[PDB]
Assembly symmetry: C3
């Protein structure tokens, strides 16, 4: 008896009945204990004696054994105990070997990380992926990870070790071909990694989520070639109520918080600080095997960010056999600011970027039906390289409504460089243009339409304060075609502007071009007493359909025409009134209108 | 001693003190074990021996006993163990009998479902409600369920069995008259049911929530008469960060993801696929006993959906003694699309539907103060039956601002059928009208105002591309009264349209009707040299207050009037200018304005 | 053996091996039990015998001991058992003494409150703070609370006891200088307190959150001087998916649900009922030590509320050495209503309030770059004291876009009282003005611009129904300066209004003032046949740049001018047309325009 009770089967010979209930199951102590399971149950030497965790012990083989055993039982949750730091100090083996895998996740085996997991000095200067859900070296020959949840109040610490080379990959949790998997509550911190979490693989996966997780200082070296904290690469997956922070200078140039790469994915309720970018929202053709070649229903909403580059970078590219498409996106409720910095010191500040592909090609995209609404954007007044939308690649549609944009540019693209084809750009008049950059815009165009062409587009400029420093509210170079488009400049705060709307190739004369903007016109009248016509002295208003006065008449003996039309020769003509006769000569501020 | 230790009281005679702390309580092993509790503690035969779960065992009596026992202790959480499937194979008894109840929930007894719960072939072809919080057959004679939470990573599987008859009801969790109850993390799957979760009962209840739950393939038969995945029927209750998916053809015609039926309820952060409808937002007078006769503070926000019918269906009906009212609703941030399908193959595609009551009556509603803002809606170009708002019943107010609507119709109602009375419909100009359906609108009206009357309403039409296929941007039949309303068509992309705004009963002549729209007018001038009047040849502009040119003057020897007013006889009249005398005859595009 | 097994070390001599796995660690029963920990392990008398909880026992010393012990082990989670009420009946000691502290929180020690915690009659009429994370009397000399999480389905009950005096402070959870701390799932109820949760202290702290918590009846006495349910006073912290309810009359006058006092803080997804206020969003200079003197990235979004005072109260104040600043705020998606009540019976109803400081000073603020968009606001028609924005202090910027405001006033400030300096107030035309208060506005101005000055501001008034009861759509007293501003009144529903826009000091004549509004003008023409001028009989249109007809011409023999300009003497002048000669005299509705 004493032999049995002191042996490992001793709890299995001690009876128990729930709260002495006569109806309850007659069990043994071991049975109630077998309901839960922890790392302590596999953290032992060959002779079954428990090993204590610490900086001089590799917990990898033990945690792996635990995962492998519970995998056999059909599932369950392993606890990684609180009040202990569990150091990992070696590479995993078999299926995860090809992915630099430390621990292999398995279906139905959840990890409750309450304690801390720290990478040992073994992993300094080399690649690693701390948790991997692939069961094969080649991911195309891998099976799925299902129903695997990592959660708790625990920490995952990458040791603070730098990358050994730019080519190396480093990840916290690679769920792999992951269906119904999540990370909740976990702090990932102190490292130099490519991602902290990757969800899915080339579209394979579903219902994967990252929630209430923290991501702190996950870039620290100039070697690090790129970073995206959470990579969503399966559909019906997303990031929610998370926190992302960086302090590293290098992070401001390379780090993005989230990437959405498949349909029905989201990023919301999250706070970001110290990153270059908020989110990539893209279809990479090379990732279209699992969930097809379209990224639709892409949601970036109610996020808070202090970034140094671009907030949302839209993108779409092609392979030889597959073409990427992006459509039905929504960016709403976000309050974003470019952080304090020198002009041109980080990648170009923007709220929306229509970026080219990895290879720098700008003539492969298919971005359309994008709604940008109810967002707040601010950039410090000194930051020249700041824009509401940086439009550097072919755009098939994007709609801006009821946003608040307080930065240097509204619409922008560098002169030279790319020559984007633009369709269906809608800038509703409900977008407010802020005044922080007033007086800073010497020689610059508020909307600098540096494109190959613009069609089926609306730009309704409305100012809410003066900036007479800008060269124009909106400018089109002669190289930019314009047709079936609406371009207006509201007169408010524009009276003293020499240029409002500028069409360098006279593109506002287009048969289906709808424009209105203020201009200053010199008029001469005939000498006739009574009703008398006034004509403009310049002859470049052949495109004008109507014009009306925006200035007072300080004269008593006459009044120029309130409204005007044009003549074959490009003069404006109206009918004023001479109370007394005499040739009149005035300079008046007119709202020039064409088919509007 | 050995007798005691091996018996069921053996753990109660084995001492324990937390981590050998001298200050800790001296307890027995049983006591620490009595803190937690699982299904294993009640899953036994009469002789106390544990029964193993499986497809040939009914776990119902055991789970019920567990719930009944913990209910007596005052509360606690029962675990349904992971790595086991717990098959249910019989009806429950007593209070839940009248509700086809399987398991009876009780106050303060939470169910941690980590394992799987599967319905046995017993329940094929008959009704069931797997969890019921009613304690009585008649729900009006039932007490409350309080502080009852069902959560975990577990699955609830309905077996995939079809309904036996349309009359049958099937539910996953009927919380009943439920206060502080929730379902979190649970996957409900593989079935044919009326609802998966019902919260509250006719307004009785509070603080009930469904979060992070998954709902997969819960309709599979033509017998199934109706489905709504989550039914919210108590105030201060809602659905949050959930996932709803269907593959069944039948689901596209009958299935709705959520219904909000009482005040202060919400649906947000959720993804829907394969449903007919997103949400019903309604006051049913028959459900007004618990929380009164008003549904106010109704929030549908930040959801993603691919549906085949209507996204949000607003509704309000009456009984002999009670009348339903709906007001103070908000629909924001949602990105919805009608899924790929043939025209007219599922219920009419719409973003907002103002539906009639169950009985088809359209003259009982009281829907007002509804805000629809910052949403994205898309329907494939072939889908004729798609609309921003389908307005088929009496409407007392709905406000559209800064939405993106890319579908066949903006405002729509079938000609014939109903004759809705419409008050306070506000379509702000900040709503963008998409171009996907351009060229598809032969013989159709973009805003087809098929109503009995329209009052205190605003329709500010703004196009962002051409569609000359449409018959009109907006049309009112002579049967539709119009008063104290504003109806405008912006000129952008409208130059080549024969009809822009059409008032078939000349309703734009109304004393308090404010309209502006483009039209083509033929004018003849007198021969007088100098200032010379032009008059329209048609005499139907007696309602016009002002008009101005939208076209150029290609002539040199004269210029028609820039602006016009009218005469008693319905002619337009302006003052142009003959440089040389002669009778002039022109056809000009005018913006016709009335009191605007 | 029997001696050992029955003693407290008995579980430590009973062997166990996880599920009889030969690879699993050979442990003792005690070891598996030592993984979890509860209040039962410290809830005993000096002799180690367990004490049962109840209304005649003080659980404070026992819970404290438990917290102190687990603090030593490095961390872990203590459970407060379900099915038991744990009464607290004494003050804590040492570091928390100066804060009226009951229990002292410590780093890494989480409290799983599943049971109920009730304050005993000891605490009636005196102050208390049930949980305190300060370790010192003076908070400036306190260390941090880190990684401390309070969660579960449990209740925290304040006993229902009233305050003994207004000076007393009462709190549920004072996290103190708190980093990575949270309260989740907990119901705080039945009391009279200053706050339920306070996060951070004067800016020190990070990543603190309140989620899924309930707050019910936490004010009940006229003694209670103030209440804010959750006070966020550290950065990167926020409230999410919470519920706040009051029934007390006193709560409607003093209670606010949330306060955001540091940068990157949020309040969203929450429901509020019975409060005076929704949220304070403020920088108090006195709280600028920890996180600096700027509150930026302040997010109030997707909340539901029935309040009786102000929804969001913006604020900013100064000390002798520090000045507060507030900027980059966003208020979106909220649906708020003033609850049913008598006019002037609670603090002034408003959606946004720009309040003065505590000391009533209105000339210290620095509020700018605030976006208010996509919100719904309603106030019962009888409530005179209701406004979209109550602007009672100096404002440096606030932008309103695409909101739905259905209340008595749009912009308001009491005449007399304060004289706010206003810059950058942008009221976009996409804001809808509701009609619930139509006919109630006798002698009142819809926008009552009672300010010292207004500059760089936009007010685009758009009505959607008639209200001829109002004195004006917008009024500026002669004391209010106006410059570099845009003020427009759309003509829709305004035809029968005697006053539309009123400038009592003729401020619309300002050189950079851009206005348009309807007015009624009397005109007389000369007798000349043919083209003939009409002049206004009044001479106060010297500021007018253009004007156009808003009324029909019922005459046949002549037509007045469609458009007009002005003369040096302040007359309007246009060119009409006399078909037959004769002096004409008409009264016409004109849209008066200035530089627009
Ligand atoms: Na070109
Ligand atoms: Na009718
Ligand atoms: Na003044």
């Amino acid at each position: 008896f004493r032999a049995i009770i002191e042996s490992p089967e001793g709890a299995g010979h001690v009876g128990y009945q729930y709260r002495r209930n006569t109806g309850s199951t007659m069990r043994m102590v071991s049975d109630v204990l077998d309901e839960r399971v922890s790392l302590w149950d596999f953290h032992c030497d060959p002779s079954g004696n428990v090993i204590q965790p610490g900086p001089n012990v590799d917990s990898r083989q033990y945690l792996q054994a635990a995962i492998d055993y519970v995998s056999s039982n059909g599932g369950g949750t392993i606890t990684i105990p609180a009040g202990y730091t569990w150091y990992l100090g070696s590479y995993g083996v078999g299926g995860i070997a090809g992915h630099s895998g430390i621990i292999q996740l398995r279906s139905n085996v959840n990890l409750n990380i309450e304690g801390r997991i720290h990478l040992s000095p073994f992993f300094d200067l080399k690649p690693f992926q701390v948790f991997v859900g692939f069961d094969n070296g080649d991911p195309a020959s891998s099976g799925n990870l299902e129903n695997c949840h990592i959660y708790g109040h625990g920490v995952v610490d990458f040791g603070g070790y730098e990358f050994g080379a730019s080519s190396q990959l480093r990840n916290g949790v690679a769920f792999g071909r992951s269906y119904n998997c999540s990370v909740t509550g976990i702090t990932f911190q102190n490292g130099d990694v490519t991602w902290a979490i990757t969800l899915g693989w080339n579209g394979y996966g579903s219902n994967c989520y990252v929630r209430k997780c923290r991501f702190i200082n996950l870039v620290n070296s100039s070697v690090n070639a790129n970073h995206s904290t959470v990579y969503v690469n399966c559909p019906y997956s997303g990031v929610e109520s998370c926190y992302f922070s960086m302090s590293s200078s290098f992070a401001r140039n390379i780090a993005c918080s989230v990437e959405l790469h498949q349909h029905d994915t989201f990023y919301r309720g999250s706070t970001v600080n110290g990153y270059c970018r908020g989110a990539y929202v893209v279809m990479h053709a090379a990732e279209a095997a699992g969930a097809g070649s379209y990224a639709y229903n892409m949601q970036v909403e109610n996020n808070i960010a202090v970034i140094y580059g671009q907030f949302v970078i839209l993108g779409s590219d092609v392979t030889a056999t597959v073409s990427g498409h992006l459509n039905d996106v929504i960016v709403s409720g976000n309050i974003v600011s470019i952080g304090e910095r020198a002009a041109f010191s980080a990648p170009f500040g923007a709220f929306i970027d229509i970026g080219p592909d990895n290879s720098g090609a700008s003539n492969v995209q298919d971005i359309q039906r994008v709604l940008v609404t109810g967002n707040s954007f601010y950039a410090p007044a000194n930051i020249t390289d700041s824009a509401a939308i940086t439009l550097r690649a072919n755009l098939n549609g994007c709609t801006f409504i009821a946003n608040n944009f307080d930065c240097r540019y509204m619409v922008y693209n560098a002169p030279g460089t790319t020559s984007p084809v633009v369709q269906n750009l809608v800038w509703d008049k409900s977008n407010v243009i802020g005044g922080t950059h007033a007086n800073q815009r010497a020689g610059q165009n508020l909307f600098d339409m540096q494109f190959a062409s613009v069609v089926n587009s609306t730009i309704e400029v409305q100012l809410s304060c003066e900036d007479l420093s800008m060269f124009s509210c909106i400018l089109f170079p002669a190289s930019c075609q314009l047709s079936y488009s609406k371009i207006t400049v509201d007169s408010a705060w524009t009276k003293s502007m020499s240029n409002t709307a500028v069409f360098e190739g006279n593109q506002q004369a287009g048969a289906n071009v709808y424009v209105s903007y203020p201009a200053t016109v010199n008029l001469t009248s005939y000498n006739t007493q009574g009703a008398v016509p006034f004509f403009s002295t310049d002859t470049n208003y052949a495109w004008v359909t109507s014009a009306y006065s925006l200035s007072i008449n300080e004269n008593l003996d006459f009044s120029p025409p309130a409204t005007y039309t044009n003549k074959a020769n490009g003069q404006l003509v109206g009918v004023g009134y001479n109370e007394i006769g005499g040739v009149r000569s005035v300079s008046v501020r007119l709202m020039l209108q064409r088919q509007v």
